[PDB]
């Protein structure tokens, strides 16, 4: 697929707002994901054991991870589709080391869209959410194809 420049614009406009507070968005998004789909918390051996949302809000490890996840996702979005190189190393560690099914990448995409919507309603109307969804679907389709070349297609 291919996003038009206008869609990339909408995606990068709201992402510039996320970048004013990367660690807070990172926490929100992972917590939203773990609440919604608790099995996804088991993939994180570092803080699998956190039982409540309050614990998750107080975990420094969870917050550092969220910043790593969002920074890598922002570097991929900023490429505007030309992300081949950024994807490689990513697809390799998630398919071979962490083993994250494509399905989980769908759950976190849902979580990202929920948080942008709650935090940025004025910059995240229908057209911008559609564009963000296209950009995340694109990312998932390219990573799934890479999983396949790597022997995982999960
Ligand atoms: C927008 C989606 C995602 C991006 C861009 C992202 C990016 C990353 C990055 C850059 C790292 C560090 C380097 C490496 O290990 O490759 C990482 C580690 C990790 N990711 Fe992902 N990730 C995404 C989704 C997920 C999801 C949905 C899960 C789990 C359900 C997940 C599980 C992990 C785990 C377990 C690690 C190790 C954390 C630690 O021990 O350091 N990731 N991810």
Cα-to-centroid distance, 117 and ligand 1 (Å) = 22
- The tokens for 106 are 């769908």
- For residue 65, which of 79, 45, 89 has the smallest C-alpha distance? 45
Q: How was this one solved?
A: X-ray
The set of protein residues with a Cβ atom below 6 angstroms from ligand 1 is 40, 43-44, 46, 65, 68-69, 72-73, 90, 93-94, 98, 100, 104-105, 108
HEC profile for the chain? CCCCHHHHHHHHHHHHHHHHHHHHHHHHHHHHHHHHCHHHHHHCHHHCCCCCHHHHHHCHHHHHHHHHHHHHHHHHHCCCCCCHHHHHHHHHHHHHHHCCCHHHHHHHHHHHHHHHHHHCCCCCCHHHHHHHHHHHHHHHHHHHHHHHHHCCCC
Residues 6 or more apart from 67 whose CB is under 8 A from it? Answer: 22, 23, 26
Going by alpha carbons, the residue nearest to atom 7 of ligand 1 is 69
Distance (Å, whole) CA 140 – CA 100: 12
- Residue 80: phi and psi, rounded to 5, are 60, 45
- For residue 70, which of 136, 7, 129, 121 has the smallest C-alpha distance? 136
Domains and CATH numbers, the chain: 1-154 (1.10.490.10)
- The tokens for 116 are 């942008």
Distance (Å, whole) CA 16 – CA 11: 9
Going by alpha carbons, the residue nearest to atom 8 of ligand 1 is 69
CB 86 within 8 A of CB 75: yes
């Amino acid at each position: 697929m291919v996003l038009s420049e206008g869609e990339w614009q909408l995606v990068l406009h709201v992402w510039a707002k996320v970048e004013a507070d990367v660690a807070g968005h990172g926490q929100d998004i992972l917590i939203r994901l773990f609440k919604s789909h608790p099995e996804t918390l088991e993939k994180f051996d570092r803080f699998k054991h956190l039982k409540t949302e309050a614990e998750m809000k107080a975990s420094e490890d969870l917050k550092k991870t969220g910043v790593t996840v969002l920074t890598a996702l922002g570097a991929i979005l900023k490429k505007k589709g030309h992300h081949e190189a950024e994807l490689k190393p990513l697809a390799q560690s998630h398919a071979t080391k962490h083993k994250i099914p494509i399905k989980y990448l769908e759950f976190i995409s849902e979580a990202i869209i929920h948080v942008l919507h709650s935090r940025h309603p004025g910059n995240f109307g229908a057209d911008a959410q559609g564009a963000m969804n296209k950009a995340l679907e694109l990312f998932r389709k390219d990573i799934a194809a890479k999983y396949k070349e790597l022997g995982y297609q999960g």
